[model samples]
Target: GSSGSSGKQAKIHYIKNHEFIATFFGQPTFCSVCKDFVWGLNKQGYKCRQCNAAIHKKCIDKIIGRCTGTAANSRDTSGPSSG
Candidate 1:
């Protein structure tokens, strides 16, 4: 029996599913994951259209958090008045 040491390959696992789409930012923005500034002339990063999660292109694979999706119909119950 010739049992020799073999190289191990590690694969990245994502906890949440995000529908990221490549886009360009018109203004300055920061990465949601690393909390770093996202800089580029075009196609700087990918953003989840559903949840509006923005992250750097290199950080897409490392992105966290689940996609909550766009909630346009949700109403705000909190009022400005204080009791």
Candidate 2:
């Protein structure tokens, strides 16, 4: 998450679990998306921090979507959550 340099609008950064980590030692796991066994250390995959959820790197973005824009630097909404 980026809040700008000094005084500016706070921005929310939506990052995937993969981006958060530099690299990981692939391991054997299950991918919720493909519903198949992932032979880690060979087939690339990602794991959730809070949970054991894993996904194949190929369709990672397709399942939960991925952010391609620059780091969040501005608000997407003009105002707070509407009531």
Candidate 3:
């Protein structure tokens, strides 16, 4: 038997904890946490050092999901707990 679907796969290494830092964007950017457009005159928000995820300062503690680290994977639609 033969198998197909052999394409170049992208690999990403994620971190356990997100390292966020304040930054300023030159162009229009969006917040990964709230899915909203980021705007400000000075340092607009914080960005993850590892995953490069941009988020508002207000959404710092509201960040959901783990850091994907430069690339994202499919969402998990299953239950959280397994016995």
Candidate 4:
């Protein structure tokens, strides 16, 4: 058995989920996966050189990053706020 402590500290290149967590541009969004405010970055996006599967940032570092999806958000569906 391998103890987790033996592993190196996570070195995640955070990409804030601004769209979900807070209103960076006068708008707010909900995370499709966590279904909550995504203040911290969990997952990232990268163009797949092979199958073009839109590889998630997490896929690179299993121990780091989070995915919020945010595409299927239910609330605040009123064609986006403009104020």
Candidate 5:
């Protein structure tokens, strides 16, 4: 076997869902790695809000930047809670 790569990968803090969604391509999604259509059944993956891309749980590192615990740029999903 011939394997060539840094072979480094990390787990992100979030996922689309622990369970499958309505159906395959229910949301009209796709995967970066494997370059296949994403179905609801394939819930094990990472979502990039900025790039508007989805990476298979197994092929997440194909992406350029590491998950910074949030999206790229200044946009953030969470907001401050009321006192």
Candidate 6:
């Protein structure tokens, strides 16, 4: 019945989904050999893995750039959630 205007609902549902994943399967921890274990999940490809870094699928897909300093810092207002 809510097939219209889902901006707010989408975000809420998206976040909640992530919470579930993190709680159950865990946030697919950074891969030790695949550069942050999987650049498409965390954004720690800058300076070093020991830094406050984390990457989204976009960041790893090279859709943005090689070393994405800060996702939001670059004004990437993308709520790229998973299915």
Give all TM-scores, in the order shown: 0.54, 0.40, 0.53, 0.20, 0.35, 0.16
Q: What TM-score does structure 6 among the candidates reach?
A: 0.16
lDDT by candidate, in order shown: 0.66, 0.50, 0.66, 0.34, 0.48, 0.30
User: lDDT per residue, candidate 3, 1-83, as tens digits?
Assistant: 98788677543323335666667766658787787767755656777778688777778778767764534343784654333
Model 2 worst lDDT run, 10 consecutive residues: 17-26
Which 10-residue span in candidate 5 carries the lowest summed lDDT? 16-25
Note the residue pairs that clash in candidate 5.
Answer: 24-39, 24-40, 25-39
Q: Residue 65 of candidate 1: its Cα lDDT? A: 55
**Top model by TM-score, which number?**
1
CA shift of 21, model 5, Å: 16
lDDT score at residue 22, model 1, on the 0-100 scale: 65
Scored against the true structure, residue 4 in model 2 reaches a CA lDDT of 57
Clashes of each: 0, 1, 0, 3, 3, 8
RMSD for each of the candidates: 13.4, 11.4, 11.4, 16.7, 13.0, 14.2
Colliding residue pairs in candidate 1: none
- Per-residue accuracy of model 6 over 5-67 as CA lDDT, tens digit each: 544322111221121111111344453224344424433331122222343332333322232
Cα deviation of 49, candidate 3, in Å: 2.0
